[PDB]
Amino acid sequence: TVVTTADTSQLYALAARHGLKLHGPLTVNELGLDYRIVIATVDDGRRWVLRIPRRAEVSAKVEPEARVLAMLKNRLPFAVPDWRVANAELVAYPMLEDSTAMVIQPGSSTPDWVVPQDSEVFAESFATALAALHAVPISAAVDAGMLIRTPTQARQKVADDVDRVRREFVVNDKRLHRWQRWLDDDSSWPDFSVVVHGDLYVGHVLIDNTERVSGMIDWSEARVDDPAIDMAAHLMVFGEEGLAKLLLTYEAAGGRVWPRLAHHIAERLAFGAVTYALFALDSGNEEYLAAAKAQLAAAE
Numbered sequence: 001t002v003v004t005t006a007d008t009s010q011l012y013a014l015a016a017r018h019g020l021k022l023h024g025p026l027t028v029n030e031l032g033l034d035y036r037i038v039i040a041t042v043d044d045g046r047r048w049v050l051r052i053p054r055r056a057e058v059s060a061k062v063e064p065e066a067r068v069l070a071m072l073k074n075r076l077p078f079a080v081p082d083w084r085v086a087n088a089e090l091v092a093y094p095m096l097e098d099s100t101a102m103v104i105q106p107g108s109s110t111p112d113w114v115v116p117q118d119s120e121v122f123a124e125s126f127a128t129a130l131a132a133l134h135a136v137p138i139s140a141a142v143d144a145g146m147l148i149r150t151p152t153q154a155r156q157k158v159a160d161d162v163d164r165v166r167r168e169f170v171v172n173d174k175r176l177h178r179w180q181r182w183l184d185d186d187s188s189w190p191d192f193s194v195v196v197h198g199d200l201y202v203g204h205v206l207i208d209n210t211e212r213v214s215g216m217i218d219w220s221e222a223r224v225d226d227p228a229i230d231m232a233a234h235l236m237v238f239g240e241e242g243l244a245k246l247l248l249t250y251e252a253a254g255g256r257v258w259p260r261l262a263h264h265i266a267e268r269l270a271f272g273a274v275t276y277a278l279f280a281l282d283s284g285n286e287e288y289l290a291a292a293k294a295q296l297a298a299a300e
């Protein structure tokens with residue numbers, strides 16, 4: 001025979017226990033630390049995504065995310081995963097066939113492609129899609145059992161993350177002072193929270209072949225929190241010019257802004273170093289830790 005990375009027999013058995021009959025081509029991404037991701041063909045002729053929790057601690061997150069997606073489905077003018085299977089040993093949904101807004105080969109550090117800076121259709125539709133998401137009523141999030149952070153709680157969470165990094169790592173003095181000045185800068189912080197995606201960047205946005213936003217995936221970090229969380233990666237990828245365009249259209253679409261929002265987003269992006277370091281720490285992966293320590297010690 002031929003050795004293949006996927007164990008088709010075990011995958012078939014797992015899927016069949018949950019009412020899904022695999023038949024035909026599949027592909028497997030084993031690089032995730034929490035889930036194995038398989039895109040498999042099913043007997044409905046469709047591709048489905050199998051998100052397979054690796055451990056009990058990951059399994060525990062399935063039911064709450066399922067409640068999130070259940071709530072969001074009718075409340076967003078774009079598609080989200082339809083978890084027709086959602087349990088501790090398997091999440092499965094029909095694949096949303098539209099491409100992600102960035103394409104990258106598994107394992108690679110460099111994308112093959114990212115939706116272009118000058119794509120006006122992408123820019124405008126991402127901005128309106130984001131305004132739509134952030135318009136989801138807080139009451140709907142509460143009814144769905146979501147994690148809720150008031151503005152005070154949102155700021156406390158950032159402080160807590162910073163302090164956890166300070167306990168576990170040695171951080172460049174100026175970097176640390178940057179975060180502390182931000183945490184102390186009342187004018188930077190919003191006086192409201194919204195439903196956020198929590199892990200939003202081009203890799204988690206789906207686009208149709210005109211480059212119009214058509215969906216968003218991987219909602220595991222969704223919660224009610226600081227709106228700027230969902231804008232940091234847009235600044236990283238599309239720069240200050242892209243951010244300026246985003247904010248004008250977001251506001252025009254009914255998105256709530258505040259005067260120092262652009263500044264706050266830049267500080268949130270800087271804070272990404274904390275997020276990465278805590279991910280590294282929690283992963284126990286020596287390569288991620290090496291990268292994190294290096295970044296933290298470095299002057300920005």
Ligand SMILES: CC[C@H]1OC(=O)[C@H](C)[C@@H](O[C@H]2C[C@@](C)(OC)[C@@H](O)[C@H](C)O2)[C@H](C)[C@@H](O[C@@H]2O[C@H](C)C[C@H](N(C)C)[C@H]2O)[C@](C)(O)C[C@@H](C)C(=O)[C@H](C)[C@@H](O)[C@]1(C)O
Pocket residue numbers: 102104108109110111198199200201202203221229232233236237272273275276279
């Ligand atoms: C452009 C293309 C690149 O995308 C990014 O720059 C975006 C903009 C990051 O988000 C930025 C921006 C932001 C806000 O996240 C959206 C911030 O939190 C993170 C740390 O960095 C992403 C996604 C980060 O991932 C996130 O890292 C988190 C620690 C966990 C999070 N997730 C699994 C829970 C995960 O998605 C992270 C580290 O770069 C992924 C690793 C693998 C990369 O090095 C890959 C190769 C990236 O360079 C990239 C795909 O090529």
Ligand SMILES: Nc1nc2c(ncn2[C@@H]2O[C@H](COP(=O)(O)OP(=O)(O)O)[C@@H](O)[C@H]2O)c(=O)[nH]1
Pocket residue numbers: 032033034035037049051081094095096097098099100203204206217218220
């Ligand atoms: N086009 C498309 N890609 C998907 C879909 N579901 C998963 N993917 C891809 O699979 C990758 C990993 O899935 P993801 O849910 O992000 O796993 P996680 O990062 O561990 O949470 C994503 O980054 C996408 O590239 C989908 O419905 N449509």
